């Protein structure tokens, strides 16, 4: 369950991968990214997008299981 | 399927809310965040990412 | 009497020319540099500052 | 005769004094201001504006001395 460093690294990498050059620079400094303890070479591309995707899907599935209810509800 | 604009708005709000003043300012421009917010509550990037890890841990428990 | 806009344009051009990419970008917005350039040649902040020190050294030689 | 560090410090202080918060931040990092060797407490307010002023005046005076020429020119 997710730390500030982890979300900061995910965001930093999103800005980099999307060519948000000015934001990447400012954010790397403001979030103190160099002092974080994450091995970037082990972080796959589109990691933020992908986890966030799966978050949306996860909520959709949490909803759809209770979507119909049962014919015995009362 | 999450769009670019949607991700961008989610991180913009995260930057604002986390007090990353200079990043929010710069990202707001670079994003062209047209400079419904109302439907994006606080901590929304974080909340969705948290659901995503829950989902990843479900694939890892296959 | 140098105006704000004039100083701002002089530093904006200095930031651009010196390769301070992120500062120029951010300053261009913060300055509202309306986003005649043609009349402001390269190294113009520097050249005027250099004349100013020449003038300061003339007051120091009073 | 003026170094990059000096003009960078002058500019940094201009952005600060004018409340250009976002630019000051970015520029302090990009110009590596912390590694410069200038004692800020000895730098007066509006220093950039003032030296730049005096530069304009200095050029005006360089011009005005040759403005009329003489009645013996030929």
Swiss-Prot record, chains A, D:
Any idea where the LisH domain is?
3-35
Give compartment(s).
Nucleus
Q: In which tissues is it expressed?
A: Ubiquitous.
Domain of life the protein comes from: Eukaryota
Residues in domain F-box-like?
Answer: 40-74
**Disulfide pairs?**
none
Q: What is the effect of changing residue 42 to A/E?
A: Does not affect interaction with NCOR2 and GPS2
What does the record say mutating residue 65 to A does?
Does not affect interaction with NCOR2 and GPS2
Per its UniProt record, which disorder involves this protein?
Hypothyroidism, congenital, non-goitrous, 8: A form of central hypothyroidism, a disorder characterized by sub-optimal thyroid hormone secretion, due to insufficient stimulation by the thyroid stimulating hormone of an otherwise normal thyroid gland. It may be caused by congenital or acquired disorders of the pituitary gland or hypothalamus. CHNG8 is a congenital, X-linked, relatively mild form which may be accompanied by hearing loss in some patients.
Its job: F-box-like protein involved in the recruitment of the ubiquitin/19S proteasome complex to nuclear receptor-regulated transcription units. Plays an essential role in transcription activation mediated by nuclear receptors. Probably acts as integral component of corepressor complexes that mediates the recruitment of the 19S proteasome complex, leading to the subsequent proteasomal degradation of transcription repressor complexes, thereby allowing cofactor exchange.
- State whether it acts alone or in a complex, and with which partners, per the record: Homotetramer; dimer of dimers. Component of the N-Cor repressor complex, at least composed of NCOR1, NCOR2, HDAC3, TBL1X, TBL1R, CORO2A and GPS2. Interacts with GPS2 (when sumoylated); leading to protect GPS2 against degradation by the proteasome. Component of a E3 ubiquitin ligase complex containing UBE2D1, SIAH1, CACYBP/SIP, SKP1, APC and TBL1X. Probably part of other corepressor complexes, that do not contain NCOR1 and NCOR2. Interacts with histones H2B, H3a and H4. Interacts with MECP2; recruits TBL1X to the heterochromatin foci. Interacts with USP44.
Entry's free-text remark on domains: The F-box-like domain is related to the F-box domain, and apparently displays the same function as component of ubiquitin E3 ligase complexes.
Q: Could you say which protein family the record assigns here? A: Belongs to the WD repeat EBI family.
Name the UniProt record assigns to this protein: F-box-like/WD repeat-containing protein TBL1X
Specify the taxonomic lineage: Eukaryota, Metazoa, Chordata, Craniata, Vertebrata
Tell me the gene name. Answer: TBL1X
Q: Which residues of the full protein are shown?
A: 53 to 126 of 577
């Amino acid at each position: 369950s997710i730390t500030s460093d982890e979300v900061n690294f995910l965001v930093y990498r999103y800005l980099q991968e999307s060519g948000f050059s000015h934001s990447a620079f400012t954010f790397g400094i403001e979030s103190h990214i160099s002092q974080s303890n994450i091995n970037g070479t082990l972080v796959p591309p589109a990691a933020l997008i992908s986890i966030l995707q799966k978050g949306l899907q996860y909520v959709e599935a949490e909803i759809s299981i209770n979507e119909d209810g049962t014919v015995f509800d009362g």
